[PDB]
Design an enzyme around this catalytic site. Structure first.
Site, mmCIF file in Angstrom:
data_model
loop_
_atom_site.group_PDB
_atom_site.id
_atom_site.type_symbol
_atom_site.label_atom_id
_atom_site.label_comp_id
_atom_site.label_asym_id
_atom_site.label_seq_id
_atom_site.Cartn_x
_atom_site.Cartn_y
_atom_site.Cartn_z
ATOM 1 N N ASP A 1 0.928 -1.123 0.025
ATOM 2 C CA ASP A 1 -0.119 0.167 0.044
ATOM 3 C C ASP A 1 0.881 1.331 -0.124
ATOM 4 O OD1 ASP A 1 -1.972 2.010 0.360
ATOM 5 O OD2 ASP A 1 -2.621 1.357 2.262
ATOM 6 N N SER A 11 -0.173 15.367 -12.322
ATOM 7 C CA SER A 11 -0.527 14.911 -13.628
ATOM 8 C C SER A 11 -0.747 16.468 -14.477
ATOM 9 C CB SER A 11 -1.645 14.051 -13.713
ATOM 10 O OG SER A 11 -2.246 13.802 -14.975
HETATM 11 C C1 LIG Z 1 -8.361 -4.034 0.289
HETATM 12 C C2 LIG Z 1 -7.842 -3.860 1.711
HETATM 13 N N1 LIG Z 1 -7.737 -2.486 2.095
HETATM 14 C C3 LIG Z 1 -8.648 -1.647 2.753
HETATM 15 C C4 LIG Z 1 -8.206 -0.242 2.981
HETATM 16 C C5 LIG Z 1 -6.789 -0.324 2.247
HETATM 17 C C6 LIG Z 1 -5.955 0.819 2.363
HETATM 18 N N2 LIG Z 1 -6.241 1.553 1.113
HETATM 19 C C7 LIG Z 1 -6.621 -1.621 1.909
#
Ligand SMILES: CCn1ccc(CN)c1
Length: 330
Positions: A35, A199
């Site tokens: 992430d 962008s």
């Molecule tokens: C799909 C799992 N997930 C939920 C929130 C995040 C972070 N953006 C990941």
């Protein structure tokens, strides 16, 4: 050093991607959602409330000879979809695709919200935004990338997400076979802790390119592309029958439609998202209304270049002293 790991969609819609991560000694392999929009490495664990675990693989620190409680440390995070998790903290050895960090903060969940419980395929998150966003208290902790950076051949990682197919996260090197043409680099602001960039504009389908600055974040942890309402309206206006549905929570379109592509600018370069990447399928099983992959950011406070956009490119997260982002077609 370098590392290289395959990342795999969790489902047929590419709702998220999971990458295997080795934690502890002997290794415990968990499938984590990498992430670039957050900075905590947290896992389902033997400490997670039992009723909130439903099929995930758990980290058990008591079975790891290299785990150590980080005494007094706690964490608690909330994400843009309203989900959340919290717990305590261990340090342990963490390896990704052959790249090993010792003493990494592994945040053990005591509690997770329902959306995490309900997703049996995601065993936790591995944050790759800037460590200034890490939630550990009272001593903030560093991300896996920040801890690895000095050991890496080059202080970079790359995201190469697939469309309905596996892709790759690389650490410490740029695979020049993984993209076409050249990589265009663009400035990053770390002021909000994100890989935030601007962008240079957009085009819808075969339409003319509109030069306009769009500030947003490169976020592998967000599924969709969230852009200003003006841009999103211009896109969906090209799809017969598309409309914004308050009851569904965004733009929907007839599943019988053929979607136009969407182009975004990176400096003078252009990344083309094929129309098919913007189809997120029926809103409910059997429906002929389909959910769009480009949605308004109006209610967020920031534009988000999520997986829909990033999977159309080979993306370099350059963590040099002055960070930058690079985008190439592929
Ligand atoms: C799909 C799992 N997930 C939920 C929130 C995040 C972070 N953006 C990941």
């Amino acid at each position: 050093s370098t590392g290289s790991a395959t990342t795999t969609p969790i489902d047929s819609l590419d709702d998220a991607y999971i990458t295997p991560v080795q934690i502890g000694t002997p290794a415990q392999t968990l499938n984590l959602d990498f992430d670039t929009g957050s900075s905590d490495l947290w896992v389902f664990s033997s400490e997670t409330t039992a009723s909130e675990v439903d099929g995930q693989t758990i980290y058990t620190p008591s079975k790891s000879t290299t785990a150590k409680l980080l005494s007094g440390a706690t964490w608690s995070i909330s994400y843009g979809d309203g989900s959340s998790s919290s717990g305590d903290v261990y340090t342990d050895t963490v390896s990704v695709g052959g790249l090993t960090v010792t003493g990494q903060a592994v945040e053990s969940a005591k509690k997770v919200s329902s959306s995490f419980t309900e997703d049996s395929t995601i065993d936790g998150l591995l944050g790759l935004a800037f460590s200034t966003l890490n939630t550990v208290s009272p001593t903030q902790q560093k991300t896996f990338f920040d801890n690895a950076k000095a050991s890496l051949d080059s202080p970079v990682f790359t995201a190469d997400l697939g469309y309905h197919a596996p892709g790759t996260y690389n650490f410490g090197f740029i695979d020049t076979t993984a993209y076409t043409g050249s990589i265009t680099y663009t400035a990053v602001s770390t002021k909000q802790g994100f890989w935030e960039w601007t962008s240079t504009g957009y085009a819808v389908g075969s339409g003319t390119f509109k030069s306009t600055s769009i500030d947003g974040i490169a976020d592998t942890g967000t599924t969709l592309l969230y852009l200003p309402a003006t841009v999103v309206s211009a896109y969906w206006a090209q799809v017969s029958g598309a409309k914004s549905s308050s009851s569904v929570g965004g733009y929907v379109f007839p599943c019988s439609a053929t979607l136009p592509s969407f182009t975004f600018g990176v400096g003078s370069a252009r990344i083309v998202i094929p129309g098919d990447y913007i189809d997120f399928g029926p809103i409910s099983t059997g429906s002929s209304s389909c959910f769009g992959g480009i949605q308004s950011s109006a209610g967020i406070g920031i534009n988000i270049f999520g997986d829909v956009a990033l999977k159309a490119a080979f993306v370099v997260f350059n963590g040099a002293t002055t960070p930058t982002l690079g985008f190439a077609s592929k």
